[PDB]
Structure formats: structure tokens, C-alpha cells
């Protein structure tokens, strides 16, 4: 009775929101983008092939100055590279061999790692002793940690497999804020440039927008058919691209609160692992389980290019803060730089 | 330039050399040690096996010292039953130790183990890694069959036509009926294994009991056979 009444109310509000969504769909993105000129083809070339990792590379991240990067391996090593000269700066041994995410703080001072060990670990790079030592370890989450990002040197956002997201303050070490709205594992999350908002995509074929200060879900974006493996903001912070296992990448915009473009090809059965944008927001890159990276031009959903230098699943793909290069790390223990 | 930056680059190369010299050593350490998964459907004596081979965090790691060969065994706990995402982290393990309770006739928990084993066998990124199958908790298997209170015909309609394999090696003091049912559960797992061609993947059934202690030796031989089978496939041959 009461459960059925609640279900009917949820259904009727869902119908109202669907009608509202359809009301604002005056014209699709295809019509407005038909006029602009296509970019043609982009021939991206490999410059540095970073070697020194034994097991698969599962996560990587760039610095603020687009010089130093971090890669994590399921071998239990966190290697901090300098892509310019292909030296390695810091081979951090990991307490747990299994790692699934790494992050660079936006000051060059701390790095963050996490994985199946259920504990996110912060390592300090500016130790007076000169030896890299673990600073803090946070163990609030129950499910395996999926990804982590830094707001500043003091606050860290973590997304784990317990269908919850958490915001921690490093000094006090306890969960400052919690986010419980998802019905499945929260696979990825991305942060707006203004850092006031962040959107997390989960395995419920849904993404959710959260505000860090207030700690409530603003809008929910649905429309995918499988688990969203990755998601990244637009450079302007007013749109986001989500890639799932249904072999289609979608583009959503916050203000219309609905999808806009449906990048897909009929010959693509393989899924998507990671997505990212360039500085201008024109070119977007998306990794694939079939060991290649397809680059879709701007908006017309035409394959601008293919990057097929890898042998196994590409797991991480990241564009530098100044847009000089794109770094792709795959499961063949090889991390490559393309431009 | 060379006036000011040359020393910085030289120091960076020295740091690279030190890091590489460390990487050689832990590379030897990593490649020398083998790794195994411990997977359990539920109530199949996984903790019993852990205690037998022994001689909050979500992953617990155990060490072996068998025949001067180092083994690491990883179990999964405090993680939700949705395992379609973190199972992909384990495509580099030597083998996945699948522990199944044979007393399963969830009313039919055995079918849950069979369906899960199908997912592991046919998974895209678990095709290379082999699975060691431990039919476990047979101590009461003979008891219920001898008692005859519960039937596997109701939960498995294809047992009645099934006959005892000719190439069977029953243990002494075992009833003929339990021996036939012992190999029926094995053949259900084997039917899944042999259905798929492309022999990069193989299954290793092994009956087990709580009283047994030599489960070290059965794992050691399986890891011996798995690694050499992979070497055979490289050199054409098998």
C-alpha cells in the first residue's frame, strides 16, 4: 500500500521530469553543428614510451605544470615520471600490491593512492628527511576504492565501491562529508574547474552532480545502457562526457539537464575505459578495450583519428593542463605520450 | 643550459640510475613470487582451507614457503557481492583457487557456484588465467547420500542418466553411490570448461576434505602444470 503509493508517486514525478526534458528539446546538436567546418584528420604521434613498470598500469595523472606525472601499477609501485626527459623521480613502494587509482594534489606536494585495500594513502613529496614516507591513511570506506581527487592540500574526494562518495579533511582525518545517492559502484568522478561541484558516474548507468559545500545531489543524468567506466568535465565546466561499456560515449549539459550528442560507430563493439578533453574542448579522446584510442573530432560524431600503439586494454588517458600532450597507460606495462 | 642546468640533469640521471637499480631487485622479487586468488561462493570452508595452509582491511594476504618457491594468496572480504568490476584486477594471477561446497542441494547454492564459474571462464580478461577447482567439504557428502534424506535428482535432473566414469580412482572405504555423485559435480564444472575451445584456459579439479593437510602439494603441482602448459603453447606443441 504505502510502498505502492511511493512507487506511483516516484513514477509520476519521473513522467513529469521526462515531459519537462522533452519540452526544452527545441533542436538537436546535429542541426546547429552542421554548419561548422570539420577538422578533418589528426595524425597523433608517439614521442615517449615510458618503460619500467612490470604489471599493468591501472591509473595515471598529470601535474599542474604538465611536466611530472604519476602511474600506479598492480605490482605495488607508484612511479612518478618526468615525461620531458623520461627519467623517474620517485618509485614509491606500496603497502598493498593491488592499486586502482592515483592522484596528484594541485600543489606538487602530495600524492594519493588507493585500491582494493580499502584505504586511501597520502604520500608527502616534500619531506625534510628526503625520504618519501606515508603521511596519512584513511579507512572509512567499506567497498574497494575506485578513484580519488584532490580539492587542495587539505581536502580529498574519494569514490569507492560501497555506492558512497566521501570528502575528507587530511589534518583531522575523518570524513568531513558523505554522499549516498547511488545504487551501484561509483566507478569514476570528475571535478569542475571551479571546484564547487563534481559529477560522479556509477554502474547504475547514471551520473550524479554533487556540491561539496552543501552535500546533496543537484541533478541526475540518465540515458546510458551500461556501466559508466569514466567521465570528464568540459573545460568550461558546463558539460561532461561519459563513457560506458555500451560502446557509446555521451555528452551531457547541465543546464538543459539532458544528453546532447551520442558519439558511436556501428563497427565499435568494444567498450570505453577512459575519456578526456583538450584545452579548447573541441577534440575529445576516449580509450577502448580493443587496445586503441579513438579521437572524435568535435561534435559531428566523426572519428577524427585512431591511436593504435598499444597491445592490451588502455586503462588511463589524460590530457595535460596546458594541452601539450595526451598520456595513455595500458595493461602492457607501457605508458605512452602522444601529440 | 650547460652553465646552470647541466648539474641538475646529471643529478636527475643519477637518481634515475639509483631508482633503476632498486627496480631490478624488486623486479626479481616480484617475478620470482607467484600469486593466487582465493574465491569462495559461500559456506565452502574457505577459512578452513586458509587455516590449513596458514603454516578493517578488505584484502588479507598470506605467505607460503613451499619448496623454496614463494607464493602469495589473496582473499577478498568486506567487498560487496557485485564482483564484475574488481575481478578484472586479477588477470595476472597464476591461478584462481575456486572453493566450492559439494553439500549444496539459496536453496540450490551449488548452481550459484556453477553460474559464477561460467562467468569467470567466459570472461574477456580472465581467458588466460586458469582456475584450480577445490570440491570441498565432502566429509558430509557420503553421509547424506548414505542417509538418503536429500536427493540431487531434484536439483539436478541429469544425474540419473549419468554413470560412474570408467577412468575413475575411488578412495578406499567409499560407497559406490557417493563416488558417482562425487564425479557428477566435477563433470558439471568440466562441461563448462571443455565447452569452450581455444585452449589458453584449463581447469584442475581436486577433491578436498577438512582433515587433509597436503593441499600445499596439490596447489604446487597445479602451479607447476599451469606454468609449463603456458610454455608449451608458446612453442606450438600443446
Amino acid at each position: 500500500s504505502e510502498l505502492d503509493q511511493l512507487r506511483q508517486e516516484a513514477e509520476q514525478l519521473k513522467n513529469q521530469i521526462r515531459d519537462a526534458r522533452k519540452a526544452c528539446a527545441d533542436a538537436t546538436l546535429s542541426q546547429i553543428t552542421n554548419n561548422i567546418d570539420p577538422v578533418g584528420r589528426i595524425q597523433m604521434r608517439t614521442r615517449r614510451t615510458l618503460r619500467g613498470h612490470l604489471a599493468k598500469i591501472y591509473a595515471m595523472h598529470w601535474g599542474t605544470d604538465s611536466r611530472l606525472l604519476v602511474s600506479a601499477s598492480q605490482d605495488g609501485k607508484l612511479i612518478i615520471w618526468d615525461s620531458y626527459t623520461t627519467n623517474k623521480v620517485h618509485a614509491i613502494p606500496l603497502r598493498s600490491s593491488w592499486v586502482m587509482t592515483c592522484a596528484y594534489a594541485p600543489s606538487g606536494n602530495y600524492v594519493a593512492c588507493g585500491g582494493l585495500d580499502n584505504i586511501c594513502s597520502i604520500y608527502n613529496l616534500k619531506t625534510r628527511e628526503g625520504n618519501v614516507r606515508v603521511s596519512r591513511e584513511l579507512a572509512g570506506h567499506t567497498g574497494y576504492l575506485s578513484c580519488c581527487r584532490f580539492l587542495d592540500d587539505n581536502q580529498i574526494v574519494t569514490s569507492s565501491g560501497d555506492t558512497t562518495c566521501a570528502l575528507w579533511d587530511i589534518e583531522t582525518g575523518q570524513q568531513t562529508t558523505t554522499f549516498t545517492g547511488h545504487t551501484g559502484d561509483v566507478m569514476s568522478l570528475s571535478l569542475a574547474p571551479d571546484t564547487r561541484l563534481f559529477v560522479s558516474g556509477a554502474c547504475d548507468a547514471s551520473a550524479k552532480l554533487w556540491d561539496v559545500r552543501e552535500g546533496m545531489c543537484r541533478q541526475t543524468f540518465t540515458g546510458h545502457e551500461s556501466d559508466i567506466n569514466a567521465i570528464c568535465f568540459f573545460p568550461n565546466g558546463n558539460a561532461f562526457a561519459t563513457g560506458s561499456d555500451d560502446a557509446t560515449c555521451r555528452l551531457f549539459d547541465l543546464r538543459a539537464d539532458q544528453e546532447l550528442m551520442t558519439y558511436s560507430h556501428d563497427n565499435i563493439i568494444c567498450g570505453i575505459t577512459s575519456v578526456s578533453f583538450s584545452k579548447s574542448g573541441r577534440l575529445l579522446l576516449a580509450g577502448y578495450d580493443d587496445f586503441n584510442c579513438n579521437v572524435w573530432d568535435a561534435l559531428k560524431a566523426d572519428r577524427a583519428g585512431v591511436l593504435a600503439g598499444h597491445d592490451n586494454r588502455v586503462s588511463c588517458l589524460g590530457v595535460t593542463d596546458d594541452g601539450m600532450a595526451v598520456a595513455t597507460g595500458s595493461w602492457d606495462s607501457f605508458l605512452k605520450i602522444w601529440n | 643550459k650547460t652553465e646552470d642546468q647541466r648539474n641538475e640533469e646529471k643529478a636527475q640521471r643519477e637518481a634515475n640510475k639509483k631508482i633503476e637499480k632498486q627496480l631490478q631487485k624488486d623486479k626479481q622479487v616480484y617475478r620470482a613470487t607467484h600469486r593466487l586468488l582465493l574465491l569462495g561462493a559461500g559456506e565452502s570452508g574457505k577459512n578452513t582451507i586458509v587455516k590449513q595452509m596458514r603454516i578493517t582491511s578488505g584484502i588479507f594476504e598470506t605467505k607460503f614457503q613451499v619448496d623454496k618457491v614463494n607464493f602469495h594468496m589473496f582473499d577478498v572480504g568486506a567487498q560487496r557481492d557485485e564482483r564484475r568490476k574488481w575481478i578484472q584486477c586479477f588477470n595476472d594471477v597464476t591461478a584462481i583457487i575456486f572453493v566450492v561446497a559439494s553439500s549444496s542441494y539459496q536453496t540450490n547454492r551449488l548452481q550459484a557456484a556453477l553460474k559464477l564459474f561460467d562467468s569467470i571462464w567466459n570472461n574477456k580478461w580472465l581467458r588466460d588465467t586458469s582456475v584450480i577447482l577445490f570440491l570441498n567439504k565432502q566429509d558430509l557428502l557420503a553421509e547424506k547420500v548414505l542417509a538418503g534424506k536429500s536427493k540431487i535428482e531434484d536439483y539436478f535432473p541429469e544425474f540419473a542418466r549419468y554413470t560412474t566414469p570408467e577412468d575413475a580412482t575411488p578412495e578406499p572405504g567409499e560407497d559406490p553411490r557417493v563416488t558417482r555423485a562425487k564425479y557428477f559435480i566435477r563433470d558439471e564444472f568440466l562441461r563448462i570448461s571443455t565447452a569452450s575451445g581455444d585452449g589458453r584456459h584449463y581447469c584442475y579439479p581436486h577433491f578436498t576434505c577438512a582433515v587433509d593437510t597436503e593441499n600445499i602439494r596439490r596447489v604446487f603441482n597445479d602451479c607447476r602444470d599451469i606454468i609449463q602448459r603456458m610454455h608449451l603453447r608458446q612453442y606450438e606443441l600443446l
Partner: nanobody
């Protein structure tokens, strides 16, 4: 939005035939693999039947073997489960589930307590 609606099922006499319908939307019915799972009272989810992408490989659990027929209408995007000669132990809450990824032989996490791609669930009761 990916939603699945289950129709049919109720208090029925034993030995009868019941048809359960799963209507799907928001995704390509052709690409994915359909499963039927049932929830007994006081017990967890147990898998019952499955139908593959094209409709060739069909498998059932032991209890429902020989009495259950699973079919799919790709044009109508409708998954039919036909039940014949029902038994008192067959009462449960049924669920039309979809495996997470398309074009994949494996089909993970269909009996978990919290699964996103599972319907609200129809109720089937068998009693005198």
C-alpha cells in the same frame, strides 16, 4: 532511463500454466542477454533461466527444467517466460534481469541483493 516492467503472476492453482512478460526500454534488446531470477521468501536470489542474444543457447536451473520456456520477441522487445505444471515450492518474487555488458558471453552479478539492471519484480504465488 533504463527500466524493465514485469507483468503477470498471482495466486494460481497448482499444475497450471502462467505467462510472465518483461517489457524493456532505453536499451537495445537485441544486443544483450536476458535472465530470469526468482526470490524465495526468506532466502536470497537464485538464478532460474537465461536466453542469449540471438536465441540459440538456452539454459535453465534444475528445478525449472522441462517445465519452463524462455523466449524473446526482438521486434516487441518483450521477454516471455512460460511456466507449466507449477509446484507449491515455485512461489517467489520473479525478476527479469539483464547482464551488464552487451556482446559478452559472461553475465555477472545477476543474483546480487543490490543490482541496478533488475526490474521491480512481479509476484507469483502457488497455493491451493
Amino acid at each position: 532511463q533504463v527500466q524493465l516492467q514485469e507483468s503477470g503472476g498471482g495466486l494460481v492453482q497448482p499444475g497450471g500454466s502462467l505467462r510472465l512478460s518483461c517489457a524493456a526500454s532505453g536499451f537495445t534488446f537485441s544486443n544483450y542477454k536476458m535472465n530470469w531470477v526468482r526470490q524465495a521468501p526468506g532466502k536470497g536470489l537464485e538464478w532460474v533461466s537465461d536466453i542469449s542474444q540471438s536465441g540459440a543457447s538456452i539454459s535453465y536451473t534444475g528445478s525449472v527444467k522441462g517445465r519452463f520456456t524462455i523466449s524473446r520477441d526482438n521486434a516487441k522487445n518483450t521477454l516471455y517466460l512460460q511456466m507449466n505444471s507449477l509446484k507449491p515450492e515455485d512461489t517467489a518474487v520473479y525478476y527479469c534481469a539483464r547482464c551488464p555488458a552487451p556482446f559478452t558471453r559472461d553475465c555477472f552479478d545477476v543474483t546480487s541483493t543490490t543490482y541496478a539492471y533488475r526490474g521491480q519484480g512481479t509476484q507469483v504465488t502457488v497455493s491451493s
